Design a protein around this ligand. Structure first.
Ligand code: HEM
Ligand code: HEM
Ligand code: HW6
Ligand code: HW6
Ligand code: H4B
Ligand code: H4B
Ligand code: ZN
Lengths: 411, 407
């Protein structure tokens, strides 16, 4: 079958055949679309088909499909599964796997970069201290003094789901949030519950507005342990504005390195429950979401006061006006300090070129429009006008529940 | 089978059951989501009729009554004999209001129950259509204090006697291709403007030429009519701070009036049913003014603002976009033409979703269309999960008439 997508701005029509390789379910049916719902221990039986499917893909990609080396590797994996109940990826398969989970991430606007991903194999890791060390190295390598490089660190796969490696942090670097007795929040409201957990585990919290949280690390199904990332490893940018001299005195800063650590990487049926990855920021993620969401730092009012905008009616568009200035400030600040960042115009434009190339060379590019379109100035970015097909390819990154809800405590 | 939607800014969880009454197909499957695709007999008619009448009699608290059963029989009789049926006025009013209520792409639905319905089922000619449409325009405009209205022309019969308004909106600006290579006026309307010219319209060939109405009755060839200029309320666009803004020569019309959709009530098809409300500001300022395919004026404004257009990262587009939208809102308000901003509309839509979940068990919503084309995440709809599904009565897109019409 063939599915067409149209760009309403350019009239360019594309043809998807890749959706025919999709197997995982979307959440949608013929009667309901769940496109804006945020969220719409294996047995030997199902595993070899997942392995076979993955290895067939890997071997096609290297132009060795049906080779003796392909057949022997199939055979070798087959045996390993019935004997040990699982199997181990070769380094080459792992690298290919992690690259393709990124390539296949339909919510990711930055995928033009997918082939340039530094893979750190951490499958020999055994303890939380071991994990701490791997993560420091990842952070120093990725940061590269502001010339950010994409990377992923891959800890041992799930075995019986009783011995999982997990990073409890949602990102490697994030600020504490503290709910005050008067119901206000100090620091980042998104991180209050995680902060409380750190505190309970024995973290001594400075109680400021931009305290970098400690890593809470679980190895081998064991209870998690606290570690402080060396501060010299955490690159931060103070936020100022090119024209507005009072902007600096808001006291804002942000970290350079966005590093998602709470997702699950699936490759050939195997589950890597600790696979922290990192790239670099698109400015709106900080300027729109982190600073301007009502549930986050919520700084719109203060910025608009200082600009002396007419705040008496929403129709002055004071919020819109302030939002732009904050985002200019974030891009200005990062660029002045030589920390990699991309603006939402440049990123969406690169994404459309990537998407077109993927259609031509791959036969499709699953994309989730709800996530791809930036959270400001949507329709003046070319993605807004681009029709997209969303489907699930493996290898893949998947959401997993927070570990403090599932973890069996040992003490 | 019972489904929850969460608002991630407020943690409010709502439970949707209304979806089980969904009937038509979304485009999506378990394997593929088509959320962002713009367009994804006697036997057939009786179930559709019955489904509607049952919902109508339920709403008036008379389900399974003498009057309910009597009507089901009456309509059944009429279909068996004539192969169609006629709606009572009351049914027609309720049906139209519900087509609006069910419109999953419409942010303005808190208003759904205040809709003036103009029954034009007695209309027979294009001149009559013109009369009805002028009356709708004048009523709806109300000298700038806009009132929602729909005018409903006769229903489809055998399908070769369709009433159609060929225009996409009742009021829209012409678009002309120039020897220059560029486009003068609204590039969205080039094709339609050609059909008007090639039907005989004397085009002023200006930047803001109000198009003639092109009206089709009883499946006949369509005819041209100029809407009395004094009925077309327009707004000159100026900025509260920028003196120079007005010298761009920008204007827009006050009345948004969709005229190319099909109203389906109880299986019956109303192929000519223009309806109108009032604007949310972004529709003019973001889409009409700044779309690359539309009037595309960001470059011009940014220049007058003397912004740094060297690099995308100065956010000069975003700066200019905000000011264009400030100018749109200020102008409409200064000339007292009803308009709503995206903050106020989306805030009203969330209160309306809540009412609909409480009072009806759901509200079908298409997040891709509901979230405004600027400043998405600082409006509350951005953080609101929505379930999209198709309920009847409904408004549906229909092919452009020129492609279909037997000429
Ligand atoms: C190199 C620069 C990158 C940029 C600019 C970028 C951009 C983004 C943005 C803006 C989002 C949505 C975030 C949000 O608004 O909440 C996102 C999502 C995502 N990206 Fe990227 N990305 C980059 C690199 C990567 C890398 C290296 C990976 C993994 C190898 C990755 C995988 C993902 C995944 C799995 C999501 C969905 C996250 C979720 O569901 O929470 N991206 N990307
Ligand atoms: C009262 C003020 C109203 C407001 C502020 C409003 C707002 C909007 C907006 C912003 C859109 C998307 C427009 C676009 O981006 O193209 C829309 C779509 C729509 N609205 Fe409304 N609306 C109003 C009244 C009405 C009325 C009176 C009806 C019908 C009786 C209606 C039915 C529809 C339909 C069917 C769509 C989808 C049109 C399509 O699919 O192209 N609306 N609404
Ligand atoms: C409930 C839920 C499901 C899901 N799949 N993801 C989430 C994550 C939520 C979605 N927005 C805020 C939070 O995202 C933070 C992690 C995603 C950051 C991805 C990202 C990576 C990168 F390298 C650069 C940039 Cl600009 C962004 C939540
Ligand atoms: C191919 C296609 C399908 C479809 N369903 N709608 C369309 C209409 C195109 C899509 N974007 C702009 C254009 O819509 C304009 C007409 C709808 C305006 C609805 C509207 C009514 C109103 F009363 C107030 C406001 Cl702010 C907006 C095209
Ligand atoms: C309910 C809705 O799906 C949700 O708020 C989404 C919308 N789009 C998004 N897009 C991105 N990139 N990140 C997000 O967190 C969200 N949130
Ligand atoms: C490709 C995508 O479906 C298309 O551009 C949509 C996106 N959202 C929209 N939203 C509204 N309100 N109006 C539109 O015309 C569109 N266009
Ligand atoms: Zn869907």
């Amino acid at each position: 079958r063939f599915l067409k997508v149209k760009n309403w701005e350019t009239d360019v029509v594309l043809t998807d055949t890749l959706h025919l390789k999709s197997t995982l379910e979307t959440g949608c049916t013929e009667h309901i679309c769940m496109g804006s719902i945020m969220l719409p221990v294996r047995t030997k039986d199902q595993l070899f088909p997942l392995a076979k499917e993955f290895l067939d893909q890997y071997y096609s990609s290297i132009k060795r499909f049906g080779s003796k080396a392909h057949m022997d590797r199939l055979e070798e994996v087959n045996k390993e599964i019935e004997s040990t109940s699982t199997y181990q990826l070769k380094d080459t398969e792992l690298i290919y796997g992690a690259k393709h989970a990124w390539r296949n991430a339909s919510r990711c606007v930055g995928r033009i970069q997918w082939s340039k991903l530094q893979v750190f194999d951490a499958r020999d890791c055994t303890t939380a201290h071991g994990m701490f060390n791997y993560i420091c190295n990842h952070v120093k390598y990725a940061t590269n003094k502001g010339n950010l490089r994409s990377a992923i660190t891959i800890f041992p796969q799930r075995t019986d789901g009783k011995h999982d490696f997990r990073v409890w942090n949602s990102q490697l670097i994030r600020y504490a949030g503290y709910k005050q007795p008067d119901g206000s929040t100090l620091g980042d409201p998104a991180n209050v519950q995680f902060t409380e957990i750190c505190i309970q585990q024995g973290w001594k919290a400075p109680r400021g507005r931009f305290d970098v949280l400690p890593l809470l690390l679980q190895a081998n199904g064991n209870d998690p342990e606290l570690f402080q990332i060396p501060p010299e490893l955490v690159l931060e940018v103070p936020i100022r504005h090119p024209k507005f001299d009072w902007f600096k005195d808001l006291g804002l800063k942000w970290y350079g390195l966005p590093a998602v650590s709470n997702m699950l990487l699936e490759i050939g049926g195997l589950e890597f429950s600790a696979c922290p990855f990192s790239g670099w920021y698109m400015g709106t993620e900080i300027g729109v979401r982190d600073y301007c969401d009502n549930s986050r730092y919520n700084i719109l009012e203060e910025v608009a006061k200082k600009m002396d905008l007419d705040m008496r009616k929403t129709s002055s568009l004071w919020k819109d006006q302030a939002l732009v200035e904050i985002n200019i400030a974030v891009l200005y600040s990062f660029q002045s300090d030589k920390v990699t960042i991309v603006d939402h115009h440049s990123a969406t434009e690169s994404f459309i070129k990537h998407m077109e190339n993927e259609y031509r060379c791959r036969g499709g590019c699953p994309a989730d429009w709800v996530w791809i379109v930036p959270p400001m100035s949507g329709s003046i970015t070319p993605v807004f006008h681009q029709e997209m097909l969303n489907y699930r390819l493996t290898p893949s990154f998947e959401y997993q529940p927070d570990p403090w809800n599932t973890h069996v405590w040992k003490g």
